[PDB]
């Protein structure tokens, strides 16, 4: 029952109780490495809601990201193009910082699978995320049928293919009249609309 109260308290990220607590914990980070293990989740309710369990084979990592927009990497300022695309200094990346955070942690732990991630803290120059990973070679994982679908050779490194919750968001995967050009895959529908089909009896 108490986990419900936790959900209701963590919603009020401005009250004096919550605001002070973040201020101390954020100092606890930024003194450790950019990527490091966590012994247990700092948001038990938010971890349980996303599939985290408490049994051998589940691990939690913590990561830091630089934050801010992306500057076009080019020598000095020259682009050698037409004026319509020669800006360098107000451009924006096309994926979310969550995806970048997940990808770095996956490269670190090359024998686990990435389940999900969530937001924990935030500063002027950094954003802090926690990543839930699963071991696909443990017997205690292969035994349970609620998760062993991840042990199949088709879910290899899905963080970097865009299959987690944040990846599905940054792609246009939703129904309706609003997500027309990207409902089934932007490249796929472009091919379909742009192919020319000829039959035998024209």
């Amino acid at each position: 029952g108490a986990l419900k109260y936790l959900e209701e308290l963590s919603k009020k990220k401005q009250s004096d109780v919550v605001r002070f607590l973040l201020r101390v914990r954020c100092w606890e980070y930024r003194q450790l490495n950019v990527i490091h293990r966590a012994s247990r989740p700092s948001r038990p309710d938010k971890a349980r809601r996303l599939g985290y369990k408490a049994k051998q084979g589940y691990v939690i990592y913590r990561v830091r990201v630089r934050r801010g927009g992306r500057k076009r990497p080019v020598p000095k300022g020259a682009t050698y193009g037409k004026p319509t695309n020669q800006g360098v200094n107000q451009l924006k990346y096309q994926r979310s910082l969550r995806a970048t955070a997940e990808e770095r942690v996956g490269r670190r732990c090359s024998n686990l699978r990435v389940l999900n991630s969530y937001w924990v803290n935030q500063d002027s120059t950094y954003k802090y995320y926690e990543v839930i990973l699963v071991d696909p070679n443990h017997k205690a994982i292969r035994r349970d049928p609620r998760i062993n679908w991840i042990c199949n050779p088709v879910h290899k490194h899905r963080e970097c293919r865009g299959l987690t919750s944040t990846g599905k968001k940054s792609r246009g995967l939703n129904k309706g009249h609003r997500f027309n050009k990207t409902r089934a895959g932007r490249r796929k529908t472009w091919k379909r609309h742009n192919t020319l089909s000829l039959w035998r009896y024209r």
Binding site: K191, N194, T195, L196, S197, L198, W199, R200
Partner: peptide, 15 residues
């Protein structure tokens, strides 16, 4: 006006 020749589908396997 695009490179249409790269995406031409022919149905020679209808039967």
């Amino acid at each position: 006006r695009k490179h249409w020749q790269r995406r031409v589908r022919c149905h020679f396997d209808q039967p």
